[PDB]
CSV table of C-alpha atoms in Angstrom, one decimal:
chain,number,residue,atom,x,y,z
A,1,UNK,CA,39.0,77.5,-60.3
A,2,UNK,CA,38.6,80.0,-57.4
A,3,UNK,CA,39.7,83.5,-56.6
A,4,UNK,CA,42.2,82.5,-53.9
A,5,UNK,CA,44.5,80.6,-56.3
A,6,UNK,CA,44.3,83.4,-58.9
A,7,UNK,CA,45.0,86.1,-56.4
A,8,UNK,CA,47.9,84.1,-55.0
A,9,UNK,CA,49.3,83.6,-58.5
A,10,UNK,CA,49.0,87.3,-59.2
A,11,UNK,CA,50.8,88.2,-56.0
A,12,UNK,CA,53.6,85.7,-56.7
A,13,UNK,CA,54.0,87.2,-60.2
A,14,UNK,CA,54.4,90.7,-58.7
A,15,UNK,CA,56.8,89.3,-56.1
A,16,UNK,CA,59.0,87.7,-58.7
A,17,UNK,CA,58.8,90.8,-60.8
A,18,UNK,CA,61.2,92.6,-58.4
A,19,UNK,CA,64.6,91.1,-58.9
A,20,UNK,CA,67.3,93.8,-59.2
A,21,UNK,CA,69.8,94.0,-62.0
A,22,UNK,CA,73.3,95.5,-61.4
A,23,UNK,CA,75.6,97.2,-63.9
A,24,UNK,CA,77.3,95.1,-66.7
A,25,UNK,CA,79.0,97.7,-68.9
A,26,UNK,CA,82.4,98.1,-67.2
A,27,UNK,CA,83.0,94.4,-67.6
A,28,UNK,CA,82.8,94.5,-71.4
A,29,UNK,CA,84.6,97.9,-71.5
A,30,UNK,CA,87.5,96.3,-69.6
A,31,UNK,CA,87.5,93.0,-71.6
A,32,UNK,CA,87.8,95.0,-74.9
A,33,UNK,CA,90.9,96.7,-73.6
A,34,UNK,CA,92.3,93.5,-72.2
A,35,UNK,CA,92.1,92.0,-75.7
A,36,UNK,CA,93.3,95.0,-77.7
A,37,UNK,CA,96.6,95.2,-76.0
A,38,UNK,CA,97.0,91.4,-75.9
A,39,UNK,CA,96.5,91.4,-79.7
A,40,UNK,CA,98.7,94.4,-80.6
A,41,UNK,CA,101.6,93.8,-78.2
A,42,UNK,CA,103.4,90.9,-79.9
A,43,UNK,CA,104.2,93.2,-82.9
A,44,UNK,CA,107.1,94.7,-80.9
A,45,UNK,CA,109.0,91.4,-81.3
A,46,UNK,CA,108.9,91.6,-85.1
A,47,UNK,CA,109.6,95.3,-85.0
A,48,UNK,CA,112.8,94.8,-82.9
A,49,UNK,CA,113.8,91.8,-85.1
A,50,UNK,CA,113.5,93.8,-88.3
A,51,UNK,CA,115.3,96.8,-86.8
A,52,UNK,CA,118.2,94.8,-85.4
A,53,UNK,CA,118.7,92.4,-88.3
A,54,UNK,CA,119.7,95.0,-91.0
A,55,UNK,CA,116.7,96.2,-93.0
A,56,UNK,CA,115.7,99.8,-92.3
A,57,UNK,CA,112.2,101.0,-91.3
A,58,UNK,CA,109.4,102.2,-93.5
A,59,UNK,CA,109.3,98.9,-95.4
A,60,UNK,CA,107.9,97.2,-92.3
A,61,UNK,CA,104.2,96.9,-93.1
A,62,UNK,CA,101.1,94.7,-92.2
A,63,UNK,CA,98.9,92.3,-94.1
A,64,UNK,CA,99.6,88.9,-95.7
A,65,UNK,CA,101.9,89.4,-98.8
A,66,UNK,CA,104.6,86.8,-98.0
A,67,UNK,CA,108.1,87.9,-97.1
A,68,UNK,CA,111.6,88.2,-98.7
A,69,UNK,CA,115.1,89.3,-97.8
A,70,UNK,CA,114.4,93.0,-97.8
A,71,UNK,CA,110.8,93.7,-96.6
A,72,UNK,CA,108.9,92.3,-93.6
A,73,UNK,CA,105.2,91.6,-93.4
A,74,UNK,CA,103.8,90.4,-90.1
A,75,UNK,CA,101.1,87.8,-90.6
A,76,UNK,CA,98.1,89.8,-89.5
A,77,UNK,CA,95.6,91.8,-91.5
A,78,UNK,CA,95.0,95.5,-90.7
A,79,UNK,CA,91.4,94.5,-89.6
A,80,UNK,CA,92.1,91.1,-88.3
A,81,UNK,CA,90.4,91.9,-85.0
A,82,UNK,CA,86.8,93.1,-85.6
A,83,UNK,CA,87.0,95.4,-82.6
A,84,UNK,CA,89.3,98.0,-84.2
A,85,UNK,CA,92.0,98.7,-86.8
A,86,UNK,CA,95.8,98.4,-86.4
A,87,UNK,CA,98.3,100.8,-87.9
A,88,UNK,CA,102.1,100.7,-88.0
A,89,UNK,CA,104.6,103.2,-89.5
A,90,UNK,CA,108.2,102.9,-88.5
A,91,UNK,CA,110.4,105.8,-89.6
A,92,UNK,CA,113.7,105.5,-91.3
A,93,UNK,CA,115.4,106.6,-88.1
A,94,UNK,CA,114.0,103.6,-86.2
A,95,UNK,CA,111.5,105.7,-84.2
A,96,UNK,CA,107.9,104.7,-84.7
A,97,UNK,CA,104.5,104.0,-83.2
A,98,UNK,CA,102.0,101.1,-83.5
A,99,UNK,CA,98.5,102.2,-82.8
A,100,UNK,CA,95.1,100.5,-82.4
A,101,UNK,CA,92.0,102.6,-83.1
A,102,UNK,CA,88.6,101.3,-81.9
A,103,UNK,CA,85.9,101.2,-84.5
A,104,UNK,CA,82.4,102.6,-83.9
A,105,UNK,CA,80.6,99.9,-85.7
A,106,UNK,CA,81.9,97.0,-83.5
A,107,UNK,CA,83.4,98.3,-80.3
A,108,UNK,CA,81.4,99.4,-77.3
A,109,UNK,CA,80.0,103.0,-76.9
A,110,UNK,CA,82.5,103.8,-74.1
A,111,UNK,CA,85.5,102.4,-76.0
A,112,UNK,CA,84.4,104.1,-79.3
A,113,UNK,CA,86.8,106.2,-81.2
A,114,UNK,CA,89.5,105.6,-78.6
A,115,UNK,CA,93.1,104.9,-79.6
A,116,UNK,CA,95.9,103.0,-77.9
A,117,UNK,CA,99.5,103.5,-78.9
A,118,UNK,CA,103.0,102.0,-78.3
A,119,UNK,CA,105.8,104.3,-79.3
A,120,UNK,CA,109.5,103.6,-79.7
A,121,UNK,CA,112.0,106.4,-78.9
A,122,UNK,CA,115.0,107.1,-81.1
A,123,UNK,CA,117.5,105.7,-78.6
A,124,UNK,CA,115.5,102.5,-78.2
A,125,UNK,CA,112.9,102.8,-75.4
A,126,UNK,CA,109.3,101.4,-75.6
A,127,UNK,CA,106.5,103.4,-74.1
A,128,UNK,CA,102.7,103.1,-74.3
A,129,UNK,CA,99.7,105.4,-73.9
A,130,UNK,CA,96.0,105.4,-74.4
A,131,UNK,CA,93.0,107.7,-74.4
A,132,UNK,CA,90.4,105.6,-72.6
A,133,UNK,CA,89.1,106.3,-69.1
A,134,UNK,CA,91.4,105.6,-66.1
A,135,UNK,CA,89.3,102.6,-64.8
A,136,UNK,CA,89.2,101.0,-68.3
A,137,UNK,CA,92.9,101.5,-69.1
A,138,UNK,CA,94.9,98.2,-68.7
A,139,UNK,CA,97.4,97.8,-65.9
A,140,UNK,CA,100.4,98.5,-68.1
A,141,UNK,CA,100.0,102.0,-69.5
A,142,UNK,CA,99.1,105.5,-68.5
A,143,UNK,CA,96.4,107.9,-69.9
B,1,UNK,CA,48.6,81.1,-66.3
B,2,UNK,CA,48.2,78.5,-63.6
B,3,UNK,CA,49.9,77.6,-60.3
B,4,UNK,CA,51.7,74.5,-61.6
B,5,UNK,CA,53.9,76.5,-64.0
B,6,UNK,CA,54.6,79.2,-61.5
B,7,UNK,CA,55.6,76.7,-58.8
B,8,UNK,CA,57.8,74.8,-61.2
B,9,UNK,CA,59.5,78.0,-62.2
B,10,UNK,CA,60.0,79.0,-58.5
B,11,UNK,CA,61.5,75.5,-57.8
B,12,UNK,CA,63.8,75.6,-60.7
B,13,UNK,CA,65.0,79.1,-59.7
B,14,UNK,CA,65.9,77.8,-56.2
B,15,UNK,CA,67.6,74.7,-57.8
B,16,UNK,CA,69.7,76.9,-60.0
B,17,UNK,CA,70.5,79.1,-57.0
B,18,UNK,CA,72.8,76.4,-55.6
B,19,UNK,CA,75.9,76.4,-57.7
B,20,UNK,CA,79.1,76.3,-55.6
B,21,UNK,CA,82.0,78.7,-56.1
B,22,UNK,CA,85.6,77.7,-55.3
B,23,UNK,CA,88.5,79.9,-54.2
B,24,UNK,CA,90.1,82.2,-56.8
B,25,UNK,CA,92.6,84.3,-54.8
B,26,UNK,CA,95.7,82.1,-54.9
B,27,UNK,CA,95.6,82.2,-58.7
B,28,UNK,CA,96.0,86.0,-58.7
B,29,UNK,CA,98.4,85.9,-55.8
B,30,UNK,CA,100.7,83.6,-57.8
B,31,UNK,CA,100.3,85.4,-61.1
B,32,UNK,CA,101.4,88.7,-59.5
B,33,UNK,CA,104.6,87.0,-58.3
B,34,UNK,CA,105.2,85.2,-61.6
B,35,UNK,CA,105.1,88.6,-63.3
B,36,UNK,CA,107.2,90.6,-60.7
B,37,UNK,CA,110.2,88.3,-61.1
B,38,UNK,CA,109.8,88.0,-64.9
B,39,UNK,CA,109.9,91.9,-65.0
B,40,UNK,CA,112.7,92.6,-62.6
B,41,UNK,CA,115.1,89.7,-63.5
B,42,UNK,CA,116.5,91.0,-66.8
B,43,UNK,CA,118.2,93.9,-65.0
B,44,UNK,CA,121.0,91.5,-63.9
B,45,UNK,CA,122.3,91.5,-67.5
B,46,UNK,CA,122.7,95.3,-67.6
B,47,UNK,CA,124.2,95.3,-64.1
B,48,UNK,CA,126.8,92.7,-65.0
B,49,UNK,CA,127.6,94.5,-68.3
B,50,UNK,CA,128.1,97.8,-66.5
B,51,UNK,CA,130.2,96.2,-63.8
B,52,UNK,CA,132.4,94.2,-66.2
B,53,UNK,CA,132.8,97.0,-68.9
B,54,UNK,CA,134.7,99.5,-66.8
B,55,UNK,CA,132.4,102.0,-65.2
B,56,UNK,CA,131.9,101.7,-61.4
B,57,UNK,CA,128.7,101.3,-59.5
B,58,UNK,CA,126.5,104.0,-57.9
B,59,UNK,CA,126.1,105.7,-61.3
B,60,UNK,CA,123.9,102.8,-62.4
B,61,UNK,CA,120.3,104.1,-62.1
B,62,UNK,CA,116.8,103.6,-63.6
B,63,UNK,CA,114.5,105.7,-65.7
B,64,UNK,CA,114.7,107.1,-69.3
B,65,UNK,CA,117.4,109.8,-69.5
B,66,UNK,CA,119.5,108.5,-72.4
B,67,UNK,CA,123.0,107.1,-71.9
B,68,UNK,CA,126.6,108.1,-72.4
B,69,UNK,CA,130.2,106.7,-72.0
B,70,UNK,CA,130.1,107.0,-68.2
B,71,UNK,CA,126.7,106.5,-66.7
B,72,UNK,CA,124.1,103.7,-67.5
B,73,UNK,CA,120.3,104.1,-67.5
B,74,UNK,CA,118.3,100.9,-68.1
B,75,UNK,CA,115.3,101.7,-70.2
B,76,UNK,CA,112.6,101.2,-67.6
B,77,UNK,CA,110.8,103.7,-65.3
B,78,UNK,CA,110.8,103.1,-61.5
B,79,UNK,CA,107.0,102.6,-61.7
B,80,UNK,CA,106.8,101.0,-65.2
B,81,UNK,CA,104.8,98.1,-63.7
B,82,UNK,CA,101.7,99.3,-62.0
B,83,UNK,CA,101.9,96.4,-59.5
B,84,UNK,CA,104.8,97.8,-57.6
B,85,UNK,CA,108.0,99.9,-57.6
B,86,UNK,CA,111.6,98.9,-58.5
B,87,UNK,CA,114.7,100.2,-56.8
B,88,UNK,CA,118.4,99.6,-57.6
B,89,UNK,CA,121.4,100.8,-55.7
B,90,UNK,CA,124.8,99.3,-56.6
B,91,UNK,CA,127.6,100.2,-54.3
B,92,UNK,CA,131.1,101.3,-55.4
B,93,UNK,CA,132.5,97.9,-54.4
B,94,UNK,CA,130.2,96.1,-56.9
B,95,UNK,CA,127.9,94.6,-54.2
B,96,UNK,CA,124.3,95.7,-54.5
B,97,UNK,CA,120.6,94.7,-54.5
B,98,UNK,CA,117.7,95.2,-56.9
B,99,UNK,CA,114.4,95.2,-55.0
B,100,UNK,CA,110.7,95.2,-56.0
B,101,UNK,CA,108.2,96.5,-53.4
B,102,UNK,CA,104.5,95.8,-54.0
B,103,UNK,CA,102.2,98.7,-53.7
B,104,UNK,CA,99.0,98.7,-51.7
B,105,UNK,CA,97.0,100.7,-54.2
B,106,UNK,CA,97.4,98.2,-57.0
B,107,UNK,CA,98.7,94.8,-55.8
B,108,UNK,CA,96.4,92.2,-54.1
B,109,UNK,CA,95.8,92.2,-50.4
B,110,UNK,CA,98.0,89.1,-49.8
B,111,UNK,CA,100.9,90.5,-51.9
B,112,UNK,CA,100.6,94.0,-50.3
B,113,UNK,CA,103.7,95.6,-48.8
B,114,UNK,CA,105.7,92.6,-49.7
B,115,UNK,CA,109.3,92.9,-51.1
B,116,UNK,CA,111.3,90.7,-53.4
B,117,UNK,CA,115.1,91.2,-53.7
B,118,UNK,CA,118.0,90.0,-55.8
B,119,UNK,CA,121.4,90.6,-54.1
B,120,UNK,CA,124.9,90.4,-55.6
B,121,UNK,CA,127.7,89.4,-53.2
B,122,UNK,CA,131.1,91.1,-53.2
B,123,UNK,CA,132.9,88.2,-54.9
B,124,UNK,CA,130.2,88.0,-57.6
B,125,UNK,CA,127.4,85.6,-56.6
B,126,UNK,CA,123.7,86.3,-57.3
B,127,UNK,CA,121.2,85.3,-54.7
B,128,UNK,CA,117.5,86.1,-54.3
B,129,UNK,CA,114.9,86.3,-51.5
B,130,UNK,CA,111.4,87.4,-50.8
B,131,UNK,CA,108.9,88.0,-48.0
B,132,UNK,CA,105.8,86.5,-49.5
B,133,UNK,CA,104.1,83.3,-48.3
B,134,UNK,CA,105.7,79.9,-49.1
B,135,UNK,CA,103.0,78.9,-51.6
B,136,UNK,CA,103.1,82.3,-53.4
B,137,UNK,CA,106.9,82.5,-53.7
B,138,UNK,CA,108.1,81.6,-57.2
B,139,UNK,CA,110.1,78.4,-57.9
B,140,UNK,CA,113.4,80.2,-58.0
B,141,UNK,CA,113.9,81.8,-54.5
B,142,UNK,CA,113.5,81.1,-50.8
B,143,UNK,CA,111.7,83.0,-48.1
C,1,UNK,CA,59.4,85.8,-65.1
C,2,UNK,CA,58.2,83.0,-67.4
C,3,UNK,CA,59.1,79.5,-68.3
C,4,UNK,CA,60.5,80.3,-71.8
C,5,UNK,CA,63.4,82.4,-70.4
C,6,UNK,CA,64.2,79.9,-67.7
C,7,UNK,CA,64.2,77.0,-70.1
C,8,UNK,CA,66.4,78.9,-72.6
C,9,UNK,CA,68.8,79.8,-69.9
C,10,UNK,CA,69.0,76.2,-68.8
C,11,UNK,CA,69.6,75.1,-72.3
C,12,UNK,CA,72.3,77.6,-72.9
C,13,UNK,CA,74.0,76.5,-69.7
C,14,UNK,CA,74.1,72.9,-70.9
C,15,UNK,CA,75.4,74.1,-74.3
C,16,UNK,CA,78.2,76.1,-72.7
C,17,UNK,CA,79.0,73.1,-70.5
C,18,UNK,CA,80.4,71.2,-73.4
C,19,UNK,CA,83.8,72.8,-74.3
C,20,UNK,CA,86.5,70.2,-74.7
C,21,UNK,CA,89.9,70.4,-73.0
C,22,UNK,CA,93.0,68.9,-74.6
C,23,UNK,CA,96.1,67.5,-72.9
C,24,UNK,CA,98.5,69.9,-71.1
C,25,UNK,CA,101.1,67.6,-69.4
C,26,UNK,CA,103.7,67.1,-72.1
C,27,UNK,CA,104.1,70.9,-72.3
C,28,UNK,CA,105.3,71.1,-68.6
C,29,UNK,CA,107.2,67.8,-68.9
C,30,UNK,CA,109.2,69.3,-71.8
C,31,UNK,CA,109.6,72.7,-70.2
C,32,UNK,CA,111.2,71.1,-67.1
C,33,UNK,CA,113.8,69.3,-69.2
C,34,UNK,CA,114.4,72.4,-71.3
C,35,UNK,CA,115.3,74.3,-68.1
C,36,UNK,CA,117.3,71.5,-66.4
C,37,UNK,CA,119.9,71.3,-69.2
C,38,UNK,CA,120.0,75.0,-69.7
C,39,UNK,CA,120.8,75.4,-66.0
C,40,UNK,CA,123.3,72.5,-65.7
C,41,UNK,CA,125.2,72.9,-69.0
C,42,UNK,CA,127.3,76.0,-68.2
C,43,UNK,CA,129.3,74.1,-65.5
C,44,UNK,CA,131.3,72.5,-68.3
C,45,UNK,CA,133.1,75.8,-68.9
C,46,UNK,CA,134.3,76.0,-65.3
C,47,UNK,CA,135.2,72.3,-65.3
C,48,UNK,CA,137.3,72.7,-68.4
C,49,UNK,CA,138.9,75.9,-67.0
C,50,UNK,CA,139.8,74.2,-63.7
C,51,UNK,CA,141.2,71.1,-65.5
C,52,UNK,CA,143.3,73.1,-68.0
C,53,UNK,CA,144.6,75.8,-65.6
C,54,UNK,CA,146.6,73.5,-63.3
C,55,UNK,CA,144.6,72.4,-60.3
C,56,UNK,CA,143.6,68.8,-60.2
C,57,UNK,CA,140.1,67.4,-59.9
C,58,UNK,CA,138.3,66.3,-56.7
C,59,UNK,CA,138.7,69.8,-55.2
C,60,UNK,CA,136.2,71.1,-57.7
C,61,UNK,CA,132.9,71.4,-55.7
C,62,UNK,CA,129.7,73.4,-55.7
C,63,UNK,CA,128.1,75.9,-53.3
C,64,UNK,CA,129.1,79.5,-52.3
C,65,UNK,CA,132.3,79.3,-50.2
C,66,UNK,CA,134.4,81.9,-52.1
C,67,UNK,CA,137.5,80.8,-54.1
C,68,UNK,CA,141.3,80.7,-53.8
C,69,UNK,CA,144.4,79.7,-55.8
C,70,UNK,CA,143.9,76.0,-55.2
C,71,UNK,CA,140.2,75.1,-55.0
C,72,UNK,CA,137.3,76.1,-57.3
C,73,UNK,CA,133.7,76.7,-56.2
C,74,UNK,CA,131.2,77.5,-58.9
C,75,UNK,CA,128.7,80.1,-57.7
C,76,UNK,CA,125.6,77.9,-57.5
C,77,UNK,CA,124.1,76.0,-54.6
C,78,UNK,CA,123.4,72.3,-54.9
C,79,UNK,CA,119.7,73.1,-54.7
C,80,UNK,CA,119.6,76.4,-56.4
C,81,UNK,CA,116.9,75.2,-58.9
C,82,UNK,CA,113.9,74.0,-56.9
C,83,UNK,CA,113.2,71.4,-59.6
C,84,UNK,CA,116.0,69.1,-58.7
C,85,UNK,CA,119.5,68.7,-57.2
C,86,UNK,CA,122.9,69.0,-58.9
C,87,UNK,CA,125.9,66.8,-58.1
C,88,UNK,CA,129.5,67.1,-59.4
C,89,UNK,CA,132.4,64.7,-58.7
C,90,UNK,CA,135.5,65.1,-60.9
C,91,UNK,CA,138.1,62.3,-60.4
C,92,UNK,CA,141.8,62.9,-60.0
C,93,UNK,CA,142.3,61.6,-63.6
C,94,UNK,CA,140.1,64.3,-65.1
C,95,UNK,CA,137.2,62.0,-65.9
C,96,UNK,CA,134.0,62.9,-64.2
C,97,UNK,CA,130.2,63.4,-64.5
C,98,UNK,CA,127.9,66.3,-63.6
C,99,UNK,CA,124.4,64.9,-62.9
C,100,UNK,CA,121.0,66.5,-62.2
C,101,UNK,CA,118.4,64.4,-60.3
C,102,UNK,CA,114.8,65.5,-60.4
C,103,UNK,CA,113.1,65.7,-57.0
C,104,UNK,CA,109.7,64.2,-56.2
C,105,UNK,CA,108.5,67.1,-54.1
C,106,UNK,CA,108.8,69.7,-56.9
C,107,UNK,CA,109.2,68.2,-60.3
C,108,UNK,CA,106.3,66.8,-62.3
C,109,UNK,CA,105.1,63.1,-61.9
C,110,UNK,CA,106.5,62.1,-65.3
C,111,UNK,CA,109.9,63.7,-64.7
C,112,UNK,CA,110.1,62.4,-61.1
C,113,UNK,CA,113.2,60.5,-59.9
C,114,UNK,CA,114.7,61.0,-63.4
C,115,UNK,CA,118.4,61.8,-63.8
C,116,UNK,CA,120.3,63.6,-66.5
C,117,UNK,CA,124.1,63.4,-66.8
C,118,UNK,CA,127.0,64.9,-68.6
C,119,UNK,CA,130.2,62.7,-68.6
C,120,UNK,CA,133.7,63.6,-69.5
C,121,UNK,CA,135.9,60.8,-70.9
C,122,UNK,CA,139.5,60.4,-69.9
C,123,UNK,CA,140.9,61.6,-73.2
C,124,UNK,CA,138.7,64.7,-73.1
C,125,UNK,CA,135.3,64.1,-74.8
C,126,UNK,CA,132.0,65.4,-73.5
C,127,UNK,CA,128.9,63.1,-73.8
C,128,UNK,CA,125.5,63.4,-72.3
C,129,UNK,CA,122.7,61.0,-71.4
C,130,UNK,CA,119.3,60.9,-69.6
C,131,UNK,CA,116.6,58.5,-68.3
C,132,UNK,CA,113.5,60.4,-69.4
C,133,UNK,CA,111.1,59.4,-72.1
C,134,UNK,CA,112.1,59.8,-75.7
C,135,UNK,CA,109.6,62.6,-76.4
C,136,UNK,CA,110.6,64.5,-73.3
C,137,UNK,CA,114.4,64.2,-73.8
C,138,UNK,CA,115.9,67.5,-75.1
C,139,UNK,CA,117.3,67.7,-78.7
C,140,UNK,CA,120.9,67.3,-77.6
C,141,UNK,CA,121.2,63.9,-75.8
C,142,UNK,CA,120.2,60.3,-76.2
C,143,UNK,CA,118.3,58.0,-73.8
D,1,UNK,CA,79.4,101.4,-56.5
D,2,UNK,CA,77.3,98.5,-57.6
D,3,UNK,CA,74.2,99.8,-59.5
D,4,UNK,CA,71.5,98.9,-57.0
D,5,UNK,CA,69.9,101.0,-54.3
D,6,UNK,CA,69.9,99.8,-50.7
D,7,UNK,CA,66.1,99.4,-51.0
D,8,UNK,CA,65.7,98.5,-54.6
D,9,UNK,CA,63.7,95.3,-53.7
D,10,UNK,CA,60.6,96.4,-51.7
D,11,UNK,CA,60.7,93.1,-49.9
D,12,UNK,CA,63.7,94.0,-47.7
D,13,UNK,CA,66.9,96.0,-47.3
D,14,UNK,CA,70.5,95.1,-48.5
D,15,UNK,CA,73.7,95.9,-46.5
D,16,UNK,CA,77.3,95.4,-47.5
D,17,UNK,CA,80.4,96.1,-45.4
D,18,UNK,CA,83.7,94.7,-46.7
D,19,UNK,CA,86.5,95.0,-44.2
D,20,UNK,CA,90.0,96.2,-45.1
D,21,UNK,CA,91.3,92.6,-44.7
D,22,UNK,CA,89.0,91.4,-47.5
D,23,UNK,CA,86.6,89.6,-45.1
D,24,UNK,CA,83.1,90.8,-45.2
D,25,UNK,CA,79.4,89.9,-45.3
D,26,UNK,CA,76.5,90.9,-47.6
D,27,UNK,CA,73.2,90.7,-45.7
D,28,UNK,CA,69.5,91.0,-46.7
D,29,UNK,CA,67.1,91.9,-43.9
D,30,UNK,CA,63.4,91.4,-44.6
D,31,UNK,CA,61.1,94.4,-43.8
D,32,UNK,CA,57.9,94.1,-41.7
D,33,UNK,CA,55.9,96.5,-43.8
D,34,UNK,CA,56.3,94.5,-47.1
D,35,UNK,CA,57.4,91.0,-46.4
D,36,UNK,CA,55.1,88.2,-45.3
D,37,UNK,CA,54.5,87.5,-41.5
D,38,UNK,CA,56.6,84.3,-41.5
D,39,UNK,CA,59.5,85.9,-43.3
D,40,UNK,CA,59.3,89.1,-41.2
D,41,UNK,CA,62.5,90.4,-39.4
D,42,UNK,CA,64.5,87.5,-40.9
D,43,UNK,CA,68.0,87.9,-42.2
D,44,UNK,CA,70.0,86.1,-44.9
D,45,UNK,CA,73.7,86.5,-45.1
D,46,UNK,CA,76.7,85.6,-47.4
D,47,UNK,CA,80.1,85.8,-45.7
D,48,UNK,CA,83.6,85.8,-47.1
D,49,UNK,CA,86.3,84.2,-45.0
D,50,UNK,CA,89.8,85.8,-44.8
D,51,UNK,CA,91.5,83.2,-46.9
D,52,UNK,CA,88.8,83.5,-49.6
D,53,UNK,CA,85.9,81.1,-49.1
D,54,UNK,CA,82.2,82.1,-49.6
D,55,UNK,CA,79.6,80.7,-47.2
D,56,UNK,CA,75.9,81.5,-46.7
D,57,UNK,CA,73.4,81.3,-43.8
D,58,UNK,CA,69.9,82.3,-42.9
D,59,UNK,CA,67.5,82.5,-40.0
D,60,UNK,CA,64.3,81.4,-41.7
D,61,UNK,CA,62.5,78.1,-41.1
D,62,UNK,CA,64.0,74.9,-42.5
D,63,UNK,CA,61.2,74.4,-45.1
D,64,UNK,CA,61.5,78.0,-46.3
D,65,UNK,CA,65.3,78.2,-46.6
D,66,UNK,CA,66.4,77.9,-50.2
D,67,UNK,CA,68.3,74.8,-51.4
D,68,UNK,CA,71.7,76.5,-51.2
D,69,UNK,CA,72.2,77.4,-47.6
D,70,UNK,CA,71.9,76.1,-44.0
D,71,UNK,CA,70.1,77.5,-41.0
């Protein structure tokens, strides 16, 4: 062994120890929101079916407790998605809101304690809102 | 540390830095059009219902301002879809056109400033047209 | 940089490069047939109306050339659906057949050059047939 | 704003300029006060066509160009 090889190796080590690293948080922050809505959107179909068939609101709940000719139970647990929690509460007058609240022990720091919601007016119009940042909100709701 | 390991690592780095990347623009360009029509097609049902019930045209508008026994308001905002803007204007003679204009601040560069339209003849025939490229136009209209 | 990280990355790359992919052709092959019949079924209503009102057959055609008190023209072009072509030819004796022929430049390879048909007997009975595979034929016709 | 300074790597300088039509080029120019004599004043570039195709080129010697671009 000589000093030339060792010095060249030391120099190449320092050279390699210079690669830059860009940001990688917005990607996950957007992927979380792209999944939350994709998971909590289909419930509108069951809500509309239950409201148009004949049964009134309130009885519409979540979980996995079978079904009957009076109450409706969509086949998803309130904590099926480990990213957050889902909550539904349809009033007797048809108006209601299905909300998804991000959990702090699973979701990302930016999307922590944030809430998305889909509301149904009394006449029968579906709107949606969220509390996340503008760049992280999906391309289907406001803020 | 020796020079063999460092040189092998440098060579493997260059080897890995050679993966090709194909195109990925036509996918989004087609997905945007597949969603635009899917969003702006159902309005024909409400248009036909309003024209066949008894109320005349013109009064048919968009937004969320309730409804009555004279005017019709389909439950969608003029900017519900962030990809573009919707516009309806049914004439008193029944003939009209429902158009969707892509916005430059949301849509893709290729599908920017493009317009799709569904027209209703005076006799009662529905046609559709668009201004996008042939490969990006959906499989239900011309160009 | 060291060899451990590079080798772990190379191993994880190979691990990820192992996801299986199932078949996805029967889905489109069935969706095409589910749309063809849904598009070419409603013409039976106009056919029956024209045959029961008073006008004889033959004059019943397709396209968009207005209508009068002698000839009937259903408001659809012979190539409205880009998946195939429609053809109607009602005989003077009432018997006829409305057929849909899939095109090779738009339809899928499996559903290429295939033909569906709805025939009307002389007495007044509607039957339907097709030439597609058994698994791709809709649940309303034979083969 | 990608999280990297224009002179993050002391070996050279980075420059990006995407046109309004989508076409653009990201280039890396080696500096004379840090890079080696052979790789001095050399420039690597990655260009994006208008349709959407990524190509890459460089001005270094053939034996020094990586195994993913031409010269």
